[PDB]
Amino acid sequence: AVSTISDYTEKINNVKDEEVDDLIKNINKYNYDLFNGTAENQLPDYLNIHEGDVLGYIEIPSINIKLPIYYGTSVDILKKGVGVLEGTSLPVGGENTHSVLSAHTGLANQKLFTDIDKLKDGDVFYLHILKKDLAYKVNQIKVVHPDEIDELKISDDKDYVTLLTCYPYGINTERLLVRGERTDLSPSNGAGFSLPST
């Protein structure tokens, strides 16, 4: 709930800023190796990110969803919030990244499935990862077979995040892929920002 998000917010703000900056720098290196095929599903030792580590949270204001984000999709973890799909980009953004956020499967896929079912093209979700803020605008809702790859792959010159949910009853179930592409945090009406000059 908001106790996990509160307990993430507390612990992360109490870490040295330079250690979070280095972790962000190492994540960006993993995502590049991943895209270049010089890394594998199992995270390198230089990250100290593990199955069940909270990276932060997702806000979907359209449907008042606020859920923590864990690394990985392990079963002791899959009944709390949202999991980063092993083999997909870590959600810190950038060109040549595609992070898949997989729904957790208990009572909060019986809400979450129908809730991300309500999302349409132009809807925005916010990631809060390791004190980094990112915005994503939905541009592809896709119902897919469970042995399907192409719609979860990193696209060249693309910064994507896919919300992956399964129909929660039965086995070999159709997965719903709500794909966001990277947008500005700033609202488009208000603008006008200049650097110092003299």
Side-chain angles (χ1 to χ4, degrees):
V2 72
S3 183
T4 304
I5 296 175
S6 174
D7 180 70
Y8 159 78
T9 292
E10 200 280 346
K11 193 170 196 290
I12 199 72
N13 286 330
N14 294 338
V15 184
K16 300 275 65 163
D17 301 341
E18 62 181 7
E19 290 183 293
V20 177
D21 298 327
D22 293 347
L23 179 48
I24 292 295
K25 177 263 292 187
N26 291 334
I27 295 168
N28 285 311
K29 202 226 183 183
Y30 169 71
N31 287 346
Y32 179 79
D33 300 348
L34 186 55
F35 168 60
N36 266 84
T38 67
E40 38 99 37
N41 287 22
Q42 185 67 12
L43 288 188
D45 292 295
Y46 71 79
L47 282 176
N48 196 44
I49 310 173
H50 299 292
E51 286 289 344
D53 288 349
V54 65
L55 301 172
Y57 60 104
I58 176 158
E59 293 173 334
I60 323 186
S62 285
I63 61 195
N64 195 249
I65 272 170
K66 187 180 174 184
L67 295 165
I69 300 164
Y70 301 77
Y71 176 66
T73 55
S74 298
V75 175
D76 279 12
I77 295 149
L78 264 168
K79 300 184 297 299
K80 288 138 88 191
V82 202
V84 171
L85 195 62
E86 305 93 334
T88 76
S89 305
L90 291 175
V92 295
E95 301 298 343
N96 319 291
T97 69
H98 190 190
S99 186
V100 179
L101 307 190
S102 189
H104 283 195
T105 53
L107 286 174
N109 228 125
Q110 296 179 351
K111 79 172 69 73
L112 204 84
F113 174 83
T114 48
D115 289 334
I116 83 161
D117 200 57
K118 286 172 186 181
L119 287 163
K120 59 170 181 291
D121 283 352
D123 289 322
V124 59
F125 56 88
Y126 303 97
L127 301 185
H128 309 273
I129 298 298
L130 273 32
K131 299 190 296 187
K132 193 176 177 167
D133 309 304
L134 310 89
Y136 282 88
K137 191 151 62 191
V138 177
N139 67 0
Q140 195 185 248
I141 309 92
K142 204 85 180 182
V143 177
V144 132
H145 309 296
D147 288 357
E148 195 282 335
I149 307 302
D150 299 346
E151 297 300 339
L152 299 185
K153 289 202 313 189
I154 302 161
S155 283
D156 299 308
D157 323 334
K158 297 295 185 168
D159 181 359
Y160 292 146
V161 170
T162 293
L163 308 171
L164 182 156
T165 195
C166 336
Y167 184 77
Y169 295 122
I171 293 298
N172 311 326
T173 189
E174 293 295 75
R175 299 173 299 174
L176 177 71
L177 303 183
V178 176
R179 197 187 66 184
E181 189 172 351
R182 190 69 179 283
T183 318
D184 305 303
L185 279 45
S186 300
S188 52
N189 56 310
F193 161 44
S194 293
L195 285 303
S197 278
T198 193

mmCIF file of all heavy atoms in Angstrom, residues 3 30 34 52 63 72 83 130 133 138 141-142 151 163 172 178 183 187:
data_model
loop_
_atom_site.group_PDB
_atom_site.id
_atom_site.type_symbol
_atom_site.label_atom_id
_atom_site.label_comp_id
_atom_site.label_asym_id
_atom_site.label_seq_id
_atom_site.Cartn_x
_atom_site.Cartn_y
_atom_site.Cartn_z
ATOM 1 N N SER A 3 2.257 2.459 2.730
ATOM 2 C CA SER A 3 3.262 2.145 3.788
ATOM 3 C C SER A 3 4.587 1.705 3.138
ATOM 4 O O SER A 3 5.654 2.108 3.655
ATOM 5 C CB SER A 3 2.735 1.099 4.761
ATOM 6 O OG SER A 3 3.658 0.855 5.815
ATOM 7 N N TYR A 30 23.646 -0.654 -17.675
ATOM 8 C CA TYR A 30 22.945 -1.956 -17.854
ATOM 9 C C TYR A 30 22.001 -1.847 -19.059
ATOM 10 O O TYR A 30 22.090 -2.702 -19.956
ATOM 11 C CB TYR A 30 22.177 -2.404 -16.605
ATOM 12 C CG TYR A 30 21.267 -3.584 -16.865
ATOM 13 C CD1 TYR A 30 21.792 -4.853 -17.096
ATOM 14 C CD2 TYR A 30 19.885 -3.436 -16.943
ATOM 15 C CE1 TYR A 30 20.970 -5.940 -17.364
ATOM 16 C CE2 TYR A 30 19.055 -4.516 -17.207
ATOM 17 C CZ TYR A 30 19.597 -5.771 -17.426
ATOM 18 O OH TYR A 30 18.792 -6.840 -17.690
ATOM 19 N N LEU A 34 22.139 -4.138 -22.291
ATOM 20 C CA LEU A 34 20.888 -4.895 -22.607
ATOM 21 C C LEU A 34 20.514 -4.662 -24.075
ATOM 22 O O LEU A 34 20.416 -5.640 -24.819
ATOM 23 C CB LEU A 34 19.756 -4.459 -21.663
ATOM 24 C CG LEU A 34 18.434 -5.239 -21.763
ATOM 25 C CD1 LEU A 34 18.648 -6.747 -21.586
ATOM 26 C CD2 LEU A 34 17.405 -4.723 -20.751
ATOM 27 N N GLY A 52 12.755 -8.382 -5.645
ATOM 28 C CA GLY A 52 11.957 -7.863 -4.507
ATOM 29 C C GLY A 52 12.416 -6.506 -3.983
ATOM 30 O O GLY A 52 11.728 -5.979 -3.096
ATOM 31 N N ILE A 63 -7.116 6.838 -13.122
ATOM 32 C CA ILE A 63 -7.793 5.677 -12.453
ATOM 33 C C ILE A 63 -7.416 5.637 -10.961
ATOM 34 O O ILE A 63 -7.665 4.592 -10.332
ATOM 35 C CB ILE A 63 -7.447 4.361 -13.201
ATOM 36 C CG1 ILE A 63 -5.934 4.066 -13.205
ATOM 37 C CG2 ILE A 63 -8.047 4.382 -14.612
ATOM 38 C CD1 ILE A 63 -5.472 3.003 -14.192
ATOM 39 N N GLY A 72 11.856 -7.424 -10.730
ATOM 40 C CA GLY A 72 11.553 -8.855 -10.937
ATOM 41 C C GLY A 72 10.090 -9.204 -10.702
ATOM 42 O O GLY A 72 9.318 -8.320 -10.261
ATOM 43 N N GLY A 83 5.893 -5.356 -10.775
ATOM 44 C CA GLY A 83 7.242 -5.940 -10.937
ATOM 45 C C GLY A 83 7.884 -5.571 -12.264
ATOM 46 O O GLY A 83 7.192 -5.649 -13.291
ATOM 47 N N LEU A 130 14.049 5.981 -7.884
ATOM 48 C CA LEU A 130 15.364 6.382 -7.304
ATOM 49 C C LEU A 130 15.486 7.920 -7.295
ATOM 50 O O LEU A 130 16.595 8.421 -7.575
ATOM 51 C CB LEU A 130 16.472 5.705 -8.133
ATOM 52 C CG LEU A 130 16.902 4.282 -7.742
ATOM 53 C CD1 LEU A 130 15.768 3.445 -7.162
ATOM 54 C CD2 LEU A 130 17.538 3.559 -8.934
ATOM 55 N N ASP A 133 11.999 11.510 -11.645
ATOM 56 C CA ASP A 133 10.596 11.628 -12.129
ATOM 57 C C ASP A 133 10.611 11.410 -13.653
ATOM 58 O O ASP A 133 11.526 11.943 -14.290
ATOM 59 C CB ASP A 133 9.988 12.965 -11.680
ATOM 60 C CG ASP A 133 10.138 13.231 -10.184
ATOM 61 O OD1 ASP A 133 9.695 12.381 -9.386
ATOM 62 O OD2 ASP A 133 10.716 14.278 -9.824
ATOM 63 N N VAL A 138 0.358 7.151 -23.232
ATOM 64 C CA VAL A 138 -0.125 5.865 -23.827
ATOM 65 C C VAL A 138 -0.321 6.095 -25.334
ATOM 66 O O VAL A 138 -0.856 7.154 -25.676
ATOM 67 C CB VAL A 138 -1.415 5.367 -23.127
ATOM 68 C CG1 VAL A 138 -1.973 4.091 -23.754
ATOM 69 C CG2 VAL A 138 -1.216 5.182 -21.618
ATOM 70 N N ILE A 141 -2.556 0.235 -27.129
ATOM 71 C CA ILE A 141 -3.229 -0.796 -26.280
ATOM 72 C C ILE A 141 -3.417 -2.033 -27.165
ATOM 73 O O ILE A 141 -3.997 -1.902 -28.268
ATOM 74 C CB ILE A 141 -4.552 -0.288 -25.657
ATOM 75 C CG1 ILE A 141 -4.371 1.061 -24.944
ATOM 76 C CG2 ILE A 141 -5.168 -1.339 -24.727
ATOM 77 C CD1 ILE A 141 -4.649 2.282 -25.809
ATOM 78 N N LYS A 142 -2.928 -3.182 -26.695
ATOM 79 C CA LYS A 142 -2.691 -4.400 -27.510
ATOM 80 C C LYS A 142 -3.021 -5.616 -26.632
ATOM 81 O O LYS A 142 -2.492 -5.683 -25.503
ATOM 82 C CB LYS A 142 -1.237 -4.365 -28.007
ATOM 83 C CG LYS A 142 -0.914 -5.168 -29.266
ATOM 84 C CD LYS A 142 -1.186 -4.426 -30.575
ATOM 85 C CE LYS A 142 -0.864 -5.236 -31.819
ATOM 86 N NZ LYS A 142 -1.093 -4.460 -33.069
ATOM 87 N N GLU A 151 6.278 -7.191 -29.144
ATOM 88 C CA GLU A 151 5.638 -5.988 -28.540
ATOM 89 C C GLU A 151 6.281 -5.669 -27.181
ATOM 90 O O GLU A 151 5.935 -4.620 -26.626
ATOM 91 C CB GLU A 151 4.119 -6.182 -28.457
ATOM 92 C CG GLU A 151 3.435 -6.329 -29.817
ATOM 93 C CD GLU A 151 3.570 -5.156 -30.779
ATOM 94 O OE1 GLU A 151 3.848 -4.024 -30.311
ATOM 95 O OE2 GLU A 151 3.395 -5.374 -32.001
ATOM 96 N N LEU A 163 2.748 -1.416 -19.431
ATOM 97 C CA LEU A 163 2.013 -1.985 -18.275
ATOM 98 C C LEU A 163 1.404 -3.305 -18.756
ATOM 99 O O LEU A 163 0.520 -3.261 -19.654
ATOM 100 C CB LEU A 163 0.964 -0.981 -17.786
ATOM 101 C CG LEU A 163 1.492 0.433 -17.510
ATOM 102 C CD1 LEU A 163 0.349 1.417 -17.247
ATOM 103 C CD2 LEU A 163 2.504 0.440 -16.361
ATOM 104 N N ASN A 172 -2.545 -19.728 -19.449
ATOM 105 C CA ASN A 172 -2.181 -19.396 -20.859
ATOM 106 C C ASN A 172 -3.109 -18.269 -21.331
ATOM 107 O O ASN A 172 -3.652 -18.355 -22.455
ATOM 108 C CB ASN A 172 -2.233 -20.628 -21.776
ATOM 109 C CG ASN A 172 -1.492 -21.822 -21.212
ATOM 110 O OD1 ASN A 172 -0.478 -21.659 -20.534
ATOM 111 N ND2 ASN A 172 -2.011 -23.017 -21.462
ATOM 112 N N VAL A 178 -0.447 -2.136 -22.297
ATOM 113 C CA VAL A 178 -0.646 -0.656 -22.354
ATOM 114 C C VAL A 178 0.747 -0.023 -22.460
ATOM 115 O O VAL A 178 1.434 0.089 -21.416
ATOM 116 C CB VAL A 178 -1.446 -0.133 -21.141
ATOM 117 C CG1 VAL A 178 -1.578 1.395 -21.141
ATOM 118 C CG2 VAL A 178 -2.813 -0.811 -21.045
ATOM 119 N N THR A 183 7.239 11.383 -22.471
ATOM 120 C CA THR A 183 6.709 12.768 -22.662
ATOM 121 C C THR A 183 7.347 13.685 -21.611
ATOM 122 O O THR A 183 8.072 13.172 -20.741
ATOM 123 C CB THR A 183 5.173 12.795 -22.569
ATOM 124 O OG1 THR A 183 4.697 11.647 -23.274
ATOM 125 C CG2 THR A 183 4.526 14.051 -23.128
ATOM 126 N N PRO A 187 3.443 20.681 -17.935
ATOM 127 C CA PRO A 187 2.243 20.839 -18.763
ATOM 128 C C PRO A 187 2.531 21.792 -19.937
ATOM 129 O O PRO A 187 3.326 22.700 -19.760
ATOM 130 C CB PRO A 187 1.184 21.390 -17.790
ATOM 131 C CG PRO A 187 1.995 22.102 -16.719
ATOM 132 C CD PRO A 187 3.285 21.309 -16.608
#
